């Protein structure tokens, strides 16, 4: 997260870290057994870390749970990033508490202008070495379809939206992928991609979660 603020320990209780020997992506807990992340965050043998704040120090509220299943959307395209969503099943159920909690799925899509919370342990500079210990946060609005499509000619599919600031300065960045964009208490986005981080005219691009509610429910029901 570039241009953001320190969240505060466990203030984003649905935020998880995906760890394969090091933190590489975020995710969002949607029930005691399932995490939503990005398809491009797929690895075999993922360990989900919940209740984390400082990912490099044991602080006492963490739960480490291995993924038993990591299910990429069947139509995910790794060049265009269309359908950039993945469901991870936990080997055992997380113990829900004030610091480890699920976030609701949307019942419809959010309109442009809606304010959201974006979070993660991604780079806190647009380039160079600035990977944080503690969770960082950003408030950012959903941008219009026309703004998004003009910023990224030919690159925006029906399954993507832009959020952030056309003036730049505030954005998600490398290490934030797969993490939450939450608006009015619903999980509306997944950190996906961008051209750089926090550059003018190049806002972050996010997976449109509202398009996948049926698929999420069906996958959870059959796995």
């Amino acid at each position: 997260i570039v241009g953001g603020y320190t969240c505060g320990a466990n203030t984003v209780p649905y935020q998880v870290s995906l760890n394969s020997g090091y933190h590489f992506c975020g995710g969002s807990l949607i029930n005691s057994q399932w995490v939503v992340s990005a398809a491009h965050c797929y690895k075999s043998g993922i360990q989900v870390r919940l209740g984390e704040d400082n990912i490099n120090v044991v602080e006492g509220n963490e739960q480490f749970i291995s993924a038993s299943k990591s299910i990429v959307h069947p139509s995910y395209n790794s060049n265009t990033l269309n359908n950039d969503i993945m469901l991870i099943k936990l080997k055992s159920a997380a113990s829900l508490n004030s610091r480890v909690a699920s976030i609701s799925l949307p019942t419809s899509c959010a309109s442009a202008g809606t304010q959201c919370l974006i979070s993660g342990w991604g780079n806190t500079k647009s380039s160079g070495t600035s990977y944080p210990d503690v969770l960082k946060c950003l408030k950012a609005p959903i941008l219009s379809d026309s703004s998004c499509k003009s910023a990224y000619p030919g690159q925006i599919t029906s399954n993507m939206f832009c959020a952030g600031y056309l003036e730049g300065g505030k954005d998600s960045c490398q290490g934030d992928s797969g993490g939450p964009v939450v608006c009015s208490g619903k999980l509306q986005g997944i950190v996906s991609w961008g051209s750089g981080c926090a550059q003018k005219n190049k806002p972050g691009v996010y997976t449109k979660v509202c398009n996948y509610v049926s698929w999420i429910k069906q996958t959870i029901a059959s796995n």
């Binding site: 990005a38 965050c41 490398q174 290490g175 992928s177 991609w193 750089g196 981080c197």
Partner: protein, 34 residues
């Protein structure tokens, strides 16, 4: 990210060369994709 305006996913990934990186991401001088 590189300078070409391509699709660069925001994953944190260690790398030695561009082919280690997803999409249009390149391997930056610090050994991470961007």
């Amino acid at each position: 990210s590189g300078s070409d305006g391509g699709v660069c996913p925001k994953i944190l990934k260690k790398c030695r060369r561009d082919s280690d990186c997803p999409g249009a991401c390149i391997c930056r001088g610090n050994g991470y994709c961007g």
